[model samples]
Target: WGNELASAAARGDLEQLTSLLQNNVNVNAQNGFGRTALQVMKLGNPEIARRLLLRGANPDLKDRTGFAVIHDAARAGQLDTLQTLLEFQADVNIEDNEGNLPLHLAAKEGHLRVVEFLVKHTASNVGHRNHKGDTACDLARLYGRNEVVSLMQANG
Candidate 1:
């Protein structure tokens, strides 16, 4: 099952995945593509993730470039996926290739509820800054940039 396990996950064929892994295809086994099942499973398929998670697959698994699940979970505005991370002792502190924390993406994207949950637990340090020296709050200004463009265009 060299590429077998990998293909099942990428296709989200959970039945094949269950049977494949049960045949001793270790969940963390980097397959022919050098990626684990968790990294390639169809993004929206919670069931696919659960199967891997059930088998003790690494929940925090990401590719070599460092784009992680929570990064998209937060950016995609799915608190459920973010919650999925916390259970795995997730490093919400972790950042993407850009050095922005999960909070920054969710903030700029405007998921108020997740912003609260991350900061609500006190683990998310709002004081943390990205490479741009911006905090979660810094990027939360939805209109802050609009006025700058507005001002430049207004003939008044």
Candidate 2:
């Protein structure tokens, strides 16, 4: 049942997710790696993520890698998911275990729009450094993200 639920989330099977929820399955249940449905949904379906949140999914649940739904949303460049999470009052500045904020991940992935959104709408700081002491600008510069670097510099 756990694997089934996780797989459904991974594939963004909204019908199956709804059916599982209706069956009284634990919405907060973690899979083998301690990832909740909301985390997986961030990668596949913003609507599914919204439904899960409406159904009381815990947005702050961390995976084995210490990635919360916010991290997943940022890493995947899911602006809609990030917006929904912001509506849910998800912490924008929350860092993973490695001290990587969502902005850091977005910058590292060269997600210029996500980085811009985080800069404009969220409390994310471009000066924040990760475990390796690399700020979002530093990561963007390292990844050849010229636009992201420019955004960071302009915003900074």
Candidate 3:
């Protein structure tokens, strides 16, 4: 399920996705990797994400990694998509497979727009650490992404 949806999303094939959904496919179903249509769209295309959500894709569904659509949007540095998901009431504070939230992923990737947007929507625990004992700010600092460190600090 994840592979099918992820592939369609990666290709931005709205028509094929619609057909699959209409054929009784689960809109929020997860794949072996725990990824869903929303997550795939976030990594692939925000436009597709918007379309899928409009068509009733579940934004709240988490992958095996415990990552929701918003997390994927943040990871992909898709501020517009993250904002759209936020408007749809996607939970920004939910942790990923690594116990890191959307803000954490954004901070780690140095995604300023996503960081700002997520911070505005939810109170992400900037101090929250992953299994590796690294917080979002830690990752930003470790990667030497100065701009991201600044943004994470601002949120904190």
Candidate 4:
């Protein structure tokens, strides 16, 4: 499944992505882990993700871990990428094997903006818990992410 397009996406190389797409490389190319080029781009470069989406990259594809790019975007605090995924109709409530939803990941990472975006724009539930049984608010509070905790609390 590994391919040059996957490499380019993982590196967040927009020029490489553009060149590869122009040359007709598969936008949905997967890595060894079943992660698509678009999935790799979601954590590092929203612009590249956007370009890939414009070229018809599928955002719904999951990795070997059953985690879609939305999880990566939320964990990495990639708000633009998260928004783009949402725009593409990604399942925000989709959970990884660990039962961590995008909201759980975003709150765990202290990304208040992502948390808010998920709460407002997606079907993510604040009450949803991870494998550890920690809700978004619990993770936010544990991580000392005051703003995230506040946002989640205000919304909850």
Instruction: Pick the TM-score winner.
Output: 2
RMSD of each candidate? 6.9, 1.8, 3.2, 2.2
- Global fold similarity of model 4 (TM-score): 0.86
Worst 10 residues of 3 by lDDT: 38-47
Q: Write the per-residue lDDT of candidate 1 for residues 7-76, one digit (tens) a residue.
A: 8878979889888876866788888767877777665666777777777777666677776777777777
Q: What is the number of backbone collisions in each predicted candidate, taken in the order shown?
A: 0, 0, 3, 0
Candidate 4 residue runs with Cα over 4 Å from true position: none
After superposition, candidate 2 runs with Cα above 4 Å error: 1-3
The models' CA-based lDDT, in order, is 0.71, 0.82, 0.73, 0.81
Candidate 2 weakest ten by summed lDDT: 35-44
Candidate 1 Cα RMSD after full superposition onto the native fold (Å): 6.9
Q: For candidate 3, write residues 1-156 as lDDT tens digits.
A: 446876677677877766666665666776666667677663546667776787677787876667787887788787887877777767777887778877777877888777776666566676788888998888878878799887767756
Q: For residues 9-128, what per-residue lDDT tens digits would candidate 4 score against the true structure? A: 788888887888877567886777667788776365878888888878888777778888888888889898888777777788889898889898889889888898888767788788
Better candidate number, 1 or 4, judged by lDDT = 4
Estimate the TM-score for candidate 3.
0.75
Winner on lDDT (1 vs 3)? 3
Q: Which residue segments of model 3 deviate by more than 4 Å?
A: 1-7, 15-26, 29-35, 42-44
Between 2 and 3, whose lDDT is larger? 2
